[PDB]
Design a protein around this ligand. Structure first.
Ligand SMILES: CC[C@@]1(O)C(=O)OCc2c1cc1n(c2=O)Cc2cc3c(CN(C)C)c(O)ccc3nc2-1
Ligand SMILES: CC(=O)N[C@@H]1[C@@H](O)[C@H](O)[C@@H](CO)O[C@H]1O
Ligand SMILES: CC(=O)N[C@@H]1[C@@H](O)[C@H](O)[C@@H](CO)O[C@H]1O
Ligand SMILES: CC(=O)N[C@@H]1[C@@H](O)[C@H](O)[C@@H](CO)O[C@H]1O
Ligand SMILES: CC(=O)N[C@@H]1[C@@H](O)[C@H](O)[C@@H](CO)O[C@H]1O
Lengths: 107, 563, 118, 563, 107, 118
């Protein structure tokens, strides 16, 4: 199938920082790369569809810049309400594998 | 110069017991029925059979047969092994190239032919084309002479003929036999076998032998046969053919009784008191083999030009059906269809490759046992002569015609990538067909098989079924298919910069998927790589398949039962 | 648009499992495909399989013969029947809603946990 | 009962001038070379040539040849025209059915065979299968007897044989000729022609005739030939075959000189004083023709079962490759590919029909000139015997296997619509092959034509090119393609209720087009009707094509040059 | 090609009336049937896409109810500002033929 | 999003015609396809042909060899060059904007009239 390796399994950032979460694919997804955001105790809220679009209900800070296999998410000047567990998903094939899911931290 | 033999048992099943005799310098004849050993003993004395199947000895002038015996003796096959598509001068220069010494002069190669073609009476037909079904040529009675001249280059003292009369008319064959009678006194020992002979033939022999159901019935000079079978209990009636009255004894106007007569034959006792006195360069090899098949290729428009005209029409018809493939929703279907159709077409013309080797199989057997070439010289020459040109051309005719009419990707490199890919797939399908058809004299068998293989390969090529959606214990079969790699390479060559949803730029984002709005989406959905290695991976796979299938053909032509 | 699970939060091993997702605000026979997800402890998400709007269904090939999805259309329900349940797949289960054209898991359930012990 | 003739000029090119003589009740022999008229005069006396090409008369017992002459005389073709796949009892019951009177009893049909098979010495091989290459049977020396018995049903007084010796061994042919000698005294006038005869054959004749290059050289009884050519200037040397010494005169140990000798022959003068004294039911026809080819069909597993094995295995392989076609984005490609393949296979298997008629062409010619059947009886019988069963089965083997494995539309009527559509396309492709094969003895020609032909039709079948996107001066060619109508019917049969964008119901609205999210969108984009007439329009087109191509075959079999 | 016969070339209606404009197609359009509205002296403003959808900037009175070939537009209780020239278009094939264009009138 | 024509409102017959559509609020190299329409007196609309965002173009087959559409990308213009103009096609011309995914003539020009007389 297609496994989505979020090689940075975690981070340690501070407020007002531009963090870049990679999501390395095991095959060409062609911008079929979703981003979710699971706060602890909740279902994954959809964040970015199409690997470049955005979902209504977020600031214009989360932005996906992906091409081919090396998809990534850019969070410019993150907030307090944006620490979570970001899962990248491929919806190209049928077995919709998710990413490992990075987890932001505060130093 | 004499031949001699003793106590020959030949099995695979002994259709023989043991044959004893010597053959003088003269005219040696073998007669009998087709089921008898009249065709097997001749292959024994010409060393055309399995030595392990042989039991006895072959002693020549007090010496056994060396490895040099086949290189200084000549056996002529029953059918016309000559190149009727060429002429006598060209074919005899071929047979002079591969038999005369490399040190010998080209002037000597001009002269020694003229010592023979002048002898055969073929000076009229020197430059006249010998003859094909589709090209009018010389009469078959001199096709026989042409083959005999092919087996008289280095002046072999020992001649062997497979049925010199069958395939010719009566007075037609008499002119061959009188030429051989002229050879019967020039110190050339002719050993042959005739089915249903005639007294006009029978009156000119020197030595005679009769075989029936693997049993020997006569040995000695030819005149005394009629003298001996009178003592057997018969009498030749008034106005009967003696050579046909000799078969009147065979099938009951039993075999064991007549053989017992022969055991107590004085003709055998003298031979018993005789036998036990006895028993007691590569570049040159490729310089002319390529030329001969090249002139076969030129001298057959109905197989060379007739396979161009078609390519030319189809290239035009396919040029008219598609004609400027649009970049709309129907563009994917048309481009994939034409690319599919081209790959398939190449594979199917490749199926006539069998006609190369299957027709030339018997000539290959005789010519290698004669020792005209190393097997690799034949294999590096004929592929240079027929595999190379007849598949470089259609891969250029298709490429030049259907490229700019259809408007396939208007770059310089893609034109030549398509050219080379069609060339490679033509070669690869021809190589597979050649491996299947190496060492098989039947056409309908292999042709059936190659069609079967292809119809299975095409089911996997990627158009009739999506290769990613096959059960994983079948997705390993997608690697054994030639139409897969060429078709993958063509899809990779053409579907890169294309777009197929007009008004919808898809390379930045493809909203509303299930759309196939760019070439890459179709290419990936087929399970095809997008990296530039994904193109030439197909080519290296096809090159390896060419080498492997040519090696299988080379081994089949090497490990073939030539005997 | 509005999903919710209701089922046993426990089960004996190697027998079965039943979950039910009741959909309000929308009819499961109208437009979308409806799928299940499970998230293990030591959080890793794992999509399980979707039932189409017209009863057709496709399941995650890792779960062959074990998962089945049925539906009761007269009250907008679809059922997760998971058989021969090992104690290892004691994950938190969800029902979710897939657009088809947008392509993403647009809507989710609330979250039911299944503990497979004895 | 005697034959007689006078002043025969035969042209297309006069390879004849005029032949004069009578034939007594006895053994009439025609000898000479193959280029001579020895094979044309026999077709003249048996009325096997064009009467407009004939010039002179054929007078029998003071009466010309009526239309009843062919219905009471028997000509035997040189190759084995017997049904080696059947047995002697079955084949002679066939020849009794179509020649004996309808009023005659089946007991009489049991007895009259036993008056003949008992005479031929074939009582051992009565129920023994005659013999095929793939089924061991009786020896060919009695295949000749089998054909002769086939031409002795209604007791014809006048027998004709095309080279009774060629194709058999020496003592093998003697047993045929002694049987004919037994027929030589029972009031049966045998008229034949032998190439390269023998004195054992020559010693039992009654009348003799020699032809050479369209010139007559002898007439009269057979004994006096040796007596006449002595006066010509020759002498038969000691121990020579007289029948071969008669050809010693021909080719120069010239033609005009020997003919002038014959003009002043007393054997001709008596004949000059003789000749100028002379010259001065359908249901039954379909009841047994169907059975014979039916037993040919059963008596050949390598052509009947061997084409079912291919059907079964390829039925299962296609069942394994596809196996439950998904309703996803790849579903369109798979369904169209398989429908494509099943249709193309039917079509291309139906290039084996060219076998049926091409092999049975010479038997058809001889049997109709003998008058065993009306042409429409042959045509309504053989199609009932081979066109019907051999194409109903694979259209059911494919249908039963690949339907429920692939999961094609799970309705009762669609299963049978697919069954009937494959049946019709098998029939239609076979009917074309029948139109393009009728009246041709060559195989490699026709098969070549059929093969290009289908390759063009598939390009218009609708998969390799979108039919709506062809230039309007080519879109009229999409109607002359059998693989178009069957493939259109299958796409119409299967793509109606389907959907291919999972999670996206498209039948209400298709947002984001260029998607092909339902069966109708793919079906319309191919240029295929959605009304229920759009399905059966293909079937009525195929039925009309069956009738038209069978009528073209019927006319080619009717307007054929039988002579 | 595909010709769009608006067989009712004109009408004569009154205010508050449900008028039904047909648009007979010469082939299957599959809901690829647009509706425009050309006020005199203007370009055709898009009214209905997809033969069942609607375009923002209109009341919920214009409604297309089409199926197969017999597409139609329903104007329930038309207003004074809705007299015009309604053109139906197929955007299925490439040669995007329009309809003849009906023209409403006031009796 | 914002189109406008500017050209001669008259022409001599059988020579040529030039119209220019300057697009503001959007770049003609970005997304859409850009086409021309003409509406005759005795109003009947007639779509003429579109130039794609990447220079490719397709023209109405009734107007073969007579219409050509060029583009000057450096200022967002596309040009209507109509040659051998008969006096019969004296229609009101428009430039319009086509979505591709929505499929409809989403945006239109203002309306330029061409009278072909002498
Ligand atoms: C595309 C149809 C098909 O691949 C199939 O799926 O069914 C079987 C079959 C096919 C094509 C061809 N054949 C088949 O049996 C035989 C054949 C001969 C062809 C010849 C003549 N051969 C003797 C080389 C051509 O010159 C060109 C294309 C040819 N295509 C074909
Ligand atoms: C042919 C062309 O200009 N295509 C553009 C591409 O440059 C750009 O990356 C994309 C972003 O949406 O938009 C489209
Ligand atoms: C499979 C199924 O029920 N599909 C429905 C269809 O009946 C209905 O026409 C359409 C209207 O939007 O919605 C969807
Ligand atoms: C062709 C088709 O499926 N039409 C359906 C109709 O039967 C149903 O009443 C409606 C709402 O359910 O959706 C639509
Ligand atoms: C690969 C590609 O075409 N990228 C383009 C970029 O060059 C351009 O700046 C942008 C907006 O025009 O759209 C995108």
């Amino acid at each position: 199938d297609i496994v989505l390796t979020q090689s940075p399994s975690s981070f340690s950032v501070s407020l007002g920082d531009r963090v870049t979460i990679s999501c390395k694919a095991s095959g060409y997804i062609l911008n079929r790369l979703a981003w979710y955001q699971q706060k602890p105790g909740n279902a994954p809220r959809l964040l970015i569809s199409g690997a470049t679009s955005l979902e209504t209900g977020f600031p214009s800070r989360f932005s996906g810049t992906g091409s081919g296999k090396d998809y990534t998410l850019s969070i410019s000047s993150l907030q307090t309400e944006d620490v979570g567990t970001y899962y990248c998903q491929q919806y190209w094939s049928t077995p919709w594998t998710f990413g490992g899911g990075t987890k932001l931290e505060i130093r | 110069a004499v031949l001699s033999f003793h106590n020959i048992c030949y099995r695979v099943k002994e259709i023989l017991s043991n044959i004893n005799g010597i053959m003088k310098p003269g005219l040696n004849a073998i007669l009998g029925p087709t089921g008898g050993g009249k065709s097997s003993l001749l292959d024994v004395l010409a060393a055309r059979k399995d030595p392990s199947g042989l039991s006895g000895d072959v002693l020549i002038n007090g010496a056994p047969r060396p490895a040099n015996f086949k290189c200084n003796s000549g056996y002529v096959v029953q059918d016309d092994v000559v190149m009727g598509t060429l002429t006598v001068r060209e074919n005899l220069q071929f047979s002079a190239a591969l038999r005369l010494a490399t040190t010998m002069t080209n002037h000597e190669k001009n002269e020694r032919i003229n010592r023979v073609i002048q002898e055969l009476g073929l000076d009229k037909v020197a430059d006249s084309k010998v003859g094909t079904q589709f090209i009018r040529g010389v009469s078959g009675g001199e096709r026989k002479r042409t083959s005999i001249g092919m087996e008289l280059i280095t002046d072999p003292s020992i001649l062997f003929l497979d049925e010199p009369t069958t395939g010719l008319d009566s007075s037609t064959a008499n002119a061959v036999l009188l030429l051989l009678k002229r050879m019967s006194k020039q110190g050339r020992t002719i050993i042959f076998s005739i089915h249903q002979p005639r007294y006009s033939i029978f009156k000119l022999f020197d030595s005679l032998t009769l075989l029936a159901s693997g049993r020997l019935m006569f040995h000695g000079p030819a005149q005394e046969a009629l003298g001996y079978f009178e003592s057997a209990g018969y009498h030749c009636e008034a106005y009967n053919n003696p050579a046909d009255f000799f078969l009147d004894i065979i099938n009951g106007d039993l075999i064991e009784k007549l053989a017992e007569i022969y055991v107590n034959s004085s003709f055998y006792k003298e031979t018993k008191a005789e036998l036990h006195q006895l028993s007691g360069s590569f570049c040159h090899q490729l310089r002319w083999v390529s030329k001969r098949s090249f002139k076969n290729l030129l001298g057959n428009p109905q197989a060379s030009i007739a396979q161009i005209i078609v390519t030319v029409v189809l290239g035009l018809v396919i040029g008219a059906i598609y004609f400027g493939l649009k970049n709309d929703s129907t563009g994917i279907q048309n481009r994939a269809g034409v690319l599919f159709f081209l790959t398939t077409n190449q594979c199917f013309s490749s199926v006539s490759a069998v006609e190369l080797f299957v027709v030339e199989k018997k000539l290959f057997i005789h010519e290698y046992i004669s020792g005209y070439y190393r097997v690799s010289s034949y294999f590096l020459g004929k592929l240079l002569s027929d595999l190379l040109p007849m598949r470089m051309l259609p891969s250029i005719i298709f490429t030049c015609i259907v490229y700019f009419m259809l408007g396939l990707k208007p770059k310089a490199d893609a034109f030549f990538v398509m050219m080379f890919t069609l060339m490679m797939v033509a070669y690869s399908a021809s190589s597979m067909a050649l491996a299947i058809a190496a060492g098989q004299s039947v056409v309908s068998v292999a042709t059936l098989l190659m069609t079967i293989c292809f119809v299975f390969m095409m089911i996997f090529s990627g158009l009739l079924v999506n290769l990613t959606t096959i059960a994983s214990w079948l997705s390993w079969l997608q690697y054994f298919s030639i139409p897969r790699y060429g078709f993958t390479a063509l899809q990779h060559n053409e579907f890169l910069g294309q777009n197929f949803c007009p008004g919808l730029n898809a390379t930045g984002n493809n909203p509303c998927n299930y759309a196939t709005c760019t070439g890459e989406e179709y290419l990936v959905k087929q399970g095809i790589d997008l990296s530039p290695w994904g193109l030439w991976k197909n080519h290296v796979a096809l090159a390896c398949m060419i080498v492997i299938f040519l090696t299988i053909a080379y081994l089949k032509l090497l490990f073939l039962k030539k005997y | 648009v509005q999903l919710q699970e209701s089922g046993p939060g426990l089960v004996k091993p190697s027998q079965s499992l039943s979950l039910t997702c009741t959909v309000t605000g929308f009819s499961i026979t109208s437009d979308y495909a409806w799928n299940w997800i499970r998230q293990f402890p030591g959080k890793k998400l794992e999509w399980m399989g979707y039932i189409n709007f017209d009863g057709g269904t496709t399941y995650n090939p890792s779960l062959r013969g074990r998962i089945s999805i049925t539906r009761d259309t007269s009250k907008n329900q679809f059922f997760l029947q998971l058989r021969s349940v090992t104690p290892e797949d004691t994950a938190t289960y969800y029902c979710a809603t897939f657009y088809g054209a947008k392509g993403t898991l647009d809507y989710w359930g609330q979250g039911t946990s299944v503990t497979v012990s004895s």
